[PDB]
Design a protein around this ligand. Structure first.
Ligand code: MG
Ligand code: MG
Ligand code: MG
Ligand code: MG
Ligand code: MG
Ligand code: MG
Ligand code: MG
Ligand code: MG
Ligand code: MG
Ligand code: MG
Ligand code: MG
Ligand code: MG
Ligand code: MG
Ligand code: MG
Ligand code: MG
Ligand code: MG
Lengths: 117, 88, 104, 70, 67
RNA sequence: AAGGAGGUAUUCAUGUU
RNA sequence: GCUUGAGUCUCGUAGAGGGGGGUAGAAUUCCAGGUGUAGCGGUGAAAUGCGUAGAGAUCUGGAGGAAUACCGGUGGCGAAGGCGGCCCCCUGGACGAAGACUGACGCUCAGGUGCGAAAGCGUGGGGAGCAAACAGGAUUAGAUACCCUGGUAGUCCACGCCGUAAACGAUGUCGACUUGGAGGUUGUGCCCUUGAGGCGUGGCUUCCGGAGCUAACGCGUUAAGUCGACCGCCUGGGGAGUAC
């Protein structure tokens, strides 16, 4: 309701699922959307198209706030990782910053064991 | 290892001629001083096996030099072990 | 005597005390007959990343020839002094009595 | 890989620039290699094999570049 | 090629020289490989030590997602 | 992922960007 | 007696060599709070599991443990095992230059002594992540597995014990001699450094290859070539590195 005209789009794109969250510049979240909510399940929810429709759904959700400017923070090794950005541009926000925020450790915790499939 | 001034003092003390560094007595004296110095370090650091290996090499080299000196000149051997306080 | 090179960054709020701290450390080293080859107050410098949520520390560089006991005492003083945000002392082979690149 | 849209810069150009920056950084490769724990033996073996492969083909090219193809 | 340090006969990197370190780091903050830069191995090791010391003293950022 | 070029890969003024 | 082997001294060089103590940032986990709402998580596909007591996501603060991205390299160091953020303290070895010195003080080595990855054991701590055993969900004709969700010993620290690995270059140590080429790394001498260069001279190291050797594969100045000194080991396959 409190119009701010500038948001931050956090795109957490894992291999399985993509979560897009629009928030204020300070950190308070406004709206979110996911491929699971978009209806795709499993092999279809791990596709760029699902990420695009989730981004569109999130943009519609936060439409009430009337945000115009939008800085993008993309995180995680996700299948789409880009379709969300294209969807936001299509939805009609001025993309200000495109930033990668993937958390890379400096040889920290040990990862899980390799899968034998 | 061992400081320069300490090495110079030992060479002066034990050298037959002040510039005769190669003397067996000088070498044994240098080895003995270094061995005695490292005792405190190895008391402090019991797990320093890599350095202790070098210490063992020094000890073995000293006894070999002492054996050679005993073969060549007995009186010099007796005098040197008296000076350095080495058991046999 | 071993040549050391000390850099200790001070909280910008306590910048007015920096000459006093410089004088104290210099007096300690001189009393211990340690030489002081360089002493350059760089000032506030806008640190690349926020150390303890603070920016713009007072860098202050000092190249010294002093014994290791006094260096250890100075390091303890640095650790216990809340004013100094960070410090580093590094051994050097030769006393580099030249101008620093950023001062130059 | 921070990217800020330049003045009078098209969005498609900016997006391609961002992908180029990510490629240069090598983010996807790093996270993918860090997905699972590789044993030190496996890592050393893989690195050595790659070096051997690279060196072998270098020699092969530099030698077989002096022959009659036809 | 063209190892810059050996051209001037530099003895040590002198980590306080930020501008040279800025040339030898990437935008993301990591160290550019010697294979790309052209630096000699000895100067590369000295450069790596200097950059790490500068990072600790906060003259250079560890990464661009720090501050 | 697919196709083209160069190399064992860079020198290729900084600036600009 | 001698100085060529061996060793000592003078000056420097490079190294993740070792021990101890601090410190840095990223990241994971947990805790507290704000925003915010119905999914999250996972797979080939699912379920177990987590979430309306508000998860996941996002921001702020805090605690804790472990490990050091980039640099990083058929690069370096160590007798081998092995060693990787940065700083300080203690400490071992190697190499180069010029000389000076001692004068065979050497090589090898049964017993003996020491060091010796990982797993394991004892005592006491610590415990983030990972993970034998175990629990559950799947897959399958069966699945005491591979896959998924959890998860204890252990992995970490201190002090002891164990003493085994494809502990491998499947190549014992020392020394001498025998055509070459392309590199890497670390010294150092000279030539106008004609500016990043030119010509030497060492140490270590990777690849290709000649004679020669080899059953062949291949090795090839770092030999598996031609020789010398000492040591260890083999005598068909199983039984068996087992029984006593
Ligand atoms: Mg998994
Ligand atoms: Mg010595
Ligand atoms: Mg070696
Ligand atoms: Mg034996
Ligand atoms: Mg163990
Ligand atoms: Mg235990
Ligand atoms: Mg216990
Ligand atoms: Mg499991
Ligand atoms: Mg687990
Ligand atoms: Mg055995
Ligand atoms: Mg091994
Ligand atoms: Mg064997
Ligand atoms: Mg032997
Ligand atoms: Mg060959
Ligand atoms: Mg038995
Ligand atoms: Mg057995």
């Amino acid at each position: 309701r409190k119009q701010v005209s500038d948001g931050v789009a956090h795109i957490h794109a894992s291999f399985n699922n993509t979560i897009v969250t629009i928030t204020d510049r300070q950190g308070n979240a406004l709206g979110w959307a996911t491929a699971g909510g978009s209806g795709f399940r499993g092999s279809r929810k791990s596709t760029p198209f699902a990420a695009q429709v989730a981004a569109e759904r999130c943009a519609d959700a936060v439409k009430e706030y009337g945000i115009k400017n939008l800085e993008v923070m993309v995180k995680g090794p996700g299948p789409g990782r880009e379709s969300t950005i294209r969807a936001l541009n299509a939805a009609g926000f001025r993309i200000t910053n495109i930033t990668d925020v993937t958390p890379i450790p400096h040889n920290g915790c040990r990862p899980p064991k390799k899968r034998r499939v | 290892s061992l400081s320069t001034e300490a090495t110079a003092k030992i060479v002066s003390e034990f050298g037959r001629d002040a510039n005769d560094t190669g003397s067996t007595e000088v070498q044994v004296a240098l080895l003995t001083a270094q061995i005695n110095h490292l005792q405190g370090h190895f008391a402090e650091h019991k797990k320093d096996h890599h350095s202790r290996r070098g210490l063992l090499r020094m000890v073995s080299q000293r006894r070999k030099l002492l054996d050679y000196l005993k073969r060549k000149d007995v009186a010099r051997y007796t005098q040197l072990i008296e000076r350095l306080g080495l058991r046999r | 005597m071993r040549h050391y090179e000390i850099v200790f960054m001070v909280h910008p709020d306590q910048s007015e005390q920096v000459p006093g701290m410089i004088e104290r450390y210099t007096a300690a080293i001189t009393g211990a007959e340690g030489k002081i080859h360089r002493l350059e107050d760089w000032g506030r410098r806008q640190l690349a990343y926020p150390i303890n949520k603070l920016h713009k520390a007072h860098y202050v560089l000092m190249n010294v020839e002093a014994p290791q006991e006094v260096i250890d005492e100075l390091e303890t003083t640095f650790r216990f002094n809340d004013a100094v945000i960070r410090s580093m002392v590094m051994r050097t082979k030769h006393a580099v009595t030249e101008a620093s690149p950023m001062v130059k | 890989p921070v990217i800020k849209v330049r003045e009078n810069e098209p969005f498609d150009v900016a997006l391609r620039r961002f992908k180029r920056s990510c490629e240069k950084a090598g983010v996807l490769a790093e996270v993918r290699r860090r997905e699972f724990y590789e044993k030190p033996t496996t890592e050393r073996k893989r690195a050595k094999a790659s070096a051997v492969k690279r060196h072998a083909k270098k020699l092969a090219r530099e030698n077989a570049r002096r022959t009659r193809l036809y | 090629k063209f190892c810059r340090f050996t051209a001037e006969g530099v003895q040590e990197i002198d980590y306080k020289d930020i501008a040279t370190l800025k040339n030898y780091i990437t935008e993301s903050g990591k160290i550019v490989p010697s294979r790309i830069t052209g630096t000699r191995a000895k100067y590369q090791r000295q450069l790596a030590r200097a950059i790490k010391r500068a990072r600790y003293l906060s003259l250079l950022p560890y990464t661009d997602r720090h501050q």
